[PDB]
């Protein structure tokens with residue numbers, strides 16, 4: 001399977017910075033969602049789930065085709081709750097009908113991270129919508145009740161190594177688990193709509209307790225009211241993972257730089273960019289624009 005990136009006709013940087021600003025402005029405006037967390041967390045979750053279907057062996061899935069717009073992917077049990085992110089982006093797509101679905105879903109993830117004061121993420125245009133029959137089947141996204149061996153093995157399919165996996169999991173500092181979407185409940189920390197290295201700090205400094213929640217699933221709970229998934233707590237149980245957790249808990253700039261590289265790689269897996277394609281765009285935030 002080859003997927004070649006094709007720039008939307010005649011569009012350049014200024015066009016995509018308008019779509020960025022439109023998403024960032026609505027992120028500011030619709031601030032009440034999910035008890036004032038806002039839409040930032042569910043939009044980086046949506047960008048990860050539309051990319052997270054990729055398989056390195058036959059180049060199926062991934063962000064290229066925008067196939068989440070089809071019933072089979074939209075109704076995957078693993079995507080429960082993401083309908084809220086889709087409905088948020090739907091007005092913006094009406095306003096910019098020329099952007100492809102894969103491009104809008106991955107740009108939503110980039111815009112949320114930067115607007116929640118995370119690192120700049122270079123982004124490239126050119127994903128092309130593909131037919132309903134290219135939609136990946138359900139079951140390619142990871143389970144949360146497993147151990148380190150499972151996480152390592154699962155991420156080899158998206159060829160992410162240990163460092164890339166631990167950097168990517170730092171996004172669980174954002175938002176929260178919702179019992180009715182996944183069978184888990186609670187936030188992982190106090191700052192859950194600002195991008196920081198708090199996931200690593202909380203994993204190493206909180207007193208975690210294995211308890212059973214109302215959906216009868218086990219999760220790790222702390223006195224402070226925070227929670228960790230079995231697959232989150234895995235990162236301090238494995239010796240390779242644990243030393244990278246300690247490195248990011250002690251250096252927030254190295255975490256930001258490594259997250260940026262692994263999140264761009266995640267969003268670009270499976271896509272072939274021609275050498276006459278434009279360079280990655282670095283978008284300015286509203287704050288840097290005085291908007």
Ligand code: HEM
Nearest residue numbers: 041042045048081142143144168171175176177178181182
């Ligand atoms: C083994 C890996 C992973 C598993 C099993 C996993 C699982 C989960 C689960 C069960 C939730 C709660 C969903 C809900 O109830 O609403 C969640 C939320 C979230 N995840 Fe993951 N995840 C993984 C990796 C990642 C990665 C790599 C990213 C992003 C780069 C990510 C970003 C998020 C975000 C931002 C939320 C919060 C969503 C919200 O507040 O609505 N996840 N994760």
